[PDB]
Design a protein around this nucleic acid. Sequence first.
DNA 1: CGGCATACG
DNA 2: CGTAG
DNA 3: GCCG
Length: 326
Amino acid sequence: WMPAYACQRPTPLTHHNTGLSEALEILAEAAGFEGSEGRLLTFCRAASVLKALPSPVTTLSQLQGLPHFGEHSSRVVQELLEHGVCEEVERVRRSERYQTMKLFTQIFGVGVKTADRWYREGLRTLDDLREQPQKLTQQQKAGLQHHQDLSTPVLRSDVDALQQVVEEAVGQALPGATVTLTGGFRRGKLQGHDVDFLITHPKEGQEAGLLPRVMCRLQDQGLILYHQFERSFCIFRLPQPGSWKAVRVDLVVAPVSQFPFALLGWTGSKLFQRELRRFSRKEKGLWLNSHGLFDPEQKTFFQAASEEDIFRHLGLEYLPPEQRNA
DNA sequence: CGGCATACG
DNA sequence: CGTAG
DNA sequence: GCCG
Ligand SMILES: [Cl-]
Ligand SMILES: [Mn+2]
Ligand SMILES: [Mn+2]
Ligand SMILES: [Mn+2]
Ligand SMILES: [Mn+2]
Ligand SMILES: [Mn+2]
Ligand SMILES: [Mn+2]
Ligand SMILES: [Mn+2]
Ligand code: NA
């Protein structure tokens, strides 16, 4: 009934099991903070199964047969159904370790490994980190200075304004180049914590060298608060009533031959792409990334002119972006 | 039991 | 090590 | 943690 891989089923942005999925996602996040990537994946997959269901789970019997539900995830759901809270989830939520790792890992430039080392050193707050700044990378300094703005949701209005400025710089950098909105906004989200753009040109090879030219032009317009090639992880100055706010923007370039693969990868979701790559390799023997799809037996790359082509190569029914919210 | 996606900066 | 989806 |  329910397929085992998230790329085999539609997953809408909004659904009928929000509270249950959010609880399993807390456990997934906590597993990641402890380095348990296998448990993280199971909890993420179980949460995603619930997002794909056509109606609310009301009774434990409704889980039997569902993929990725074993003793642990089933008990979590049982406790939520019976009591409205899961004791393990609540213990994680209030724990100093979870709260501090969440705080630190949400800083741009800080991953689980850095956050854990800081935790073991006794650091607990953002001001703790600001008090010893020479121990920070340039990226972390920017992440900390802009942390408050970067925690503020990005709206669709913001996205449309950013796209116009990126298009202007891209047009001077290379006439004919195009800018496509990707990431969660392409999946239908009305808000987000960042904006993602994919840039190409219709003539294969003309996009070579493009991203430095785009970055320099945005920098000379005073729009770049931070930047560090094919991928640029920036902080942009976005106008606001009588002021402005910092916004994370990712700019990516791909040649038109690779564009459908890059569009698919950068549209996500993260779990969708991991599941699609797992399905490709384990079920079809093909190796997928955001550059291409490789047959390792014939030693050839599949040509694709669209996302539709990629789903067909993999033997999967097509899912539009708004059904990829695994 | 092994596997768990696969890139770039 | 960080970043991306 | 779960699956094959
Ligand atoms: Cl890639
Ligand atoms: Mn358990
Ligand atoms: Mn009980
Ligand atoms: Mn994004
Ligand atoms: Mn490349
Ligand atoms: Mn992004
Ligand atoms: Mn094992
Ligand atoms: Mn285990
Ligand atoms: Na981070």
